[PDB]
Amino acid sequence: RELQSLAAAVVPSAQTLKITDFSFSDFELSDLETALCTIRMFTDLNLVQNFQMKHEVLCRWILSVKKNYRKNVAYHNWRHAFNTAQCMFAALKAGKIQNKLTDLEILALLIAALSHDLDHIMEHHHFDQCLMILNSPGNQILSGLSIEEYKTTLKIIKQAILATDLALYIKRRGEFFELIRKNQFNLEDPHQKELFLAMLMTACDLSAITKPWPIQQRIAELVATEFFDQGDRERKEPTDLMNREKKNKIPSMQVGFIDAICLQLYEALTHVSEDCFPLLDGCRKNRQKWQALAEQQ
Ligand SMILES: CCCOc1ccc(S(=O)(=O)N2CCN(C)CC2)cc1-c1nc(CC)c(Br)c(=O)[nH]1
């Protein structure tokens, strides 16, 4: 049984699991290993002790989230959610963002990262499934929160999940970039705090684009596989982007995606914390590789 095995396992250290690395890859990990990494994330962010999470309940919640991801989705599945969460962890620790945030905000971000694609690119994200699982018998990892803490946390979770809509990122990013440019960025400002949390969610969600080349190349295959599947479904129920016949367009699309969407974000995030530079560096390196491919075409 998955639950018995998970609950009984020793949770290795964050160092052993490499989850502090921006360059982290999940390719060689089993599902069990991704669950243990996830436990280590909650544990090393001081969320387990601080909020009186029962070990068995945390284990069951992780398994419930994992099993509620559809298996026939090539990219937006448990592994992407898990990677989003790992990137959050790395940003908080290696990126030194943890000291900028409260415990409830960290709790909410980690849960949102893990849960944000449950109701699965300008796709809409929903938090209904996330909440249902959190309220499920035996899965109530927030039961240890006071009423006031609980209300605060749910609000942040909802906003964080919604933030992963790229349409909302595009709508709100100009204000973020300008606050930064005009040296007006101030996390003590509740509006700006909320804005920053949304941008951090996007940064983590898009983080495959920053990985070492062999890793980005493979994730890009999954993304293309999902796009083409959706094209096929739209036919039975298609642009070039979602057309398996226009695959030689992928390098050029990836350069476009980096230039239009990703680069400014990791530039802005680096301005907020220099220790997040490796995300920016990785994204720059991947553009150069995709461009070289777009020209050999
Ligand atoms: C790899 C297969 C191609 O993948 C893409 C193709 C096109 C675009 S686009 O719509 O931004 N495109 C270029 C910019 N443009 C001006 C509009 C047209 C995005 C991606 C892309 N999305 C994600 C987020 C799911 C990840 Br992750 C990723 O790696 N790739």
Side-chain angles (χ1 to χ4, degrees), residues 3 5-17 19-48 50-51 53 55 57-66 68-70 72-98 100-120 125-128 130-131 133-146 149-150 152-154 156-167 169-170 172-181 183-187 189-229 231-232 238-239 241 243 248-273 275-284 286-287 290-295 297:
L3 182 51
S5 304
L6 180 52
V10 178
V11 180
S13 71
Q15 195 181 109
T16 295
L17 299 175
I19 52 162
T20 320
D21 303 336
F22 286 116
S23 293
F24 175 95
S25 169
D26 75 294
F27 292 161
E28 308 301 332
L29 307 188
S30 65
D31 282 355
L32 166 61
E33 283 176 308
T34 67
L36 295 167
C37 282
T38 304
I39 296 169
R40 178 55 63 191
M41 292 180 212
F42 278 90
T43 305
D44 275 27
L45 286 171
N46 297 329
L47 308 172
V48 179
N50 200 24
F51 298 112
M53 293 189 187
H55 188 66
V57 171
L58 179 56
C59 291
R60 190 178 294 103
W61 180 81
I62 294 165
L63 294 181
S64 294
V65 172
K66 183 175 72 198
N68 277 268
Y69 281 96
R70 281 153 180 96
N72 66 335
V73 184
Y75 173 63
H76 290 108
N77 50 47
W78 163 245
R79 295 301 181 109
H80 177 58
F82 166 67
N83 277 307
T84 305
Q86 184 272 326
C87 187
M88 185 63 68
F89 181 85
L92 296 166
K93 292 291 189 182
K96 306 193 174 178
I97 296 168
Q98 179 175 18
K100 297 169 138 61
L101 302 185
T102 71
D103 288 335
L104 300 181
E105 289 167 348
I106 291 167
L107 177 62
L109 287 171
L110 186 57
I111 290 164
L114 287 161
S115 304
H116 75 285
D117 282 323
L118 283 170
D119 203 30
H120 190 271
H125 298 75
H126 306 93
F127 54 75
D128 271 11
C130 173
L131 293 218
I133 300 172
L134 280 170
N135 284 323
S136 280
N139 294 274
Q140 298 174 269
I141 60 162
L142 298 185
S143 70
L145 276 64
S146 72
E149 285 173 325
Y150 183 84
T152 301
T153 302
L154 280 210
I156 305 173
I157 289 168
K158 297 175 178 169
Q159 292 172 325
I161 291 170
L162 295 188
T164 64
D165 286 8
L166 277 182
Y169 161 70
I170 287 154
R172 298 185 71 194
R173 68 182 182 161
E175 174 188 2
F176 187 55
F177 298 159
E178 207 64 359
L179 285 165
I180 299 290
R181 189 183 72 84
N183 284 292
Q184 295 179 343
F185 184 63
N186 176 28
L187 280 173
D189 186 335
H191 175 67
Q192 295 187 40
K193 174 60 80 66
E194 174 191 316
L195 179 61
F196 173 65
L197 294 178
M199 297 288 130
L200 183 60
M201 288 293 302
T202 303
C204 290
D205 180 64
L206 300 183
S207 63
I209 203 64
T210 68
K211 298 291 181 173
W213 176 241
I215 298 168
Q216 153 64 199
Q217 208 163 15
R218 173 58 184 154
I219 296 177
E221 296 167 21
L222 300 177
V223 174
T225 297
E226 186 173 314
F227 283 173
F228 300 155
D229 290 351
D232 300 341
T239 64
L241 183 54
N243 184 338
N248 67 317
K249 287 182 172 301
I250 298 173
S252 169
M253 295 286 182
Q254 287 298 85
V255 171
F257 171 63
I258 287 164
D259 287 345
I261 301 298
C262 308
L263 204 55
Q264 298 161 273
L265 176 51
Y266 296 113
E267 282 165 356
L269 180 63
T270 299
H271 287 309
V272 175
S273 167
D275 303 275
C276 290
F277 176 77
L279 287 170
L280 176 63
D281 191 41
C283 183
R284 284 165 173 175
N286 280 330
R287 177 174 62 173
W290 281 121
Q291 182 61 35
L293 282 172
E295 293 176 5
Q297 198 80 58

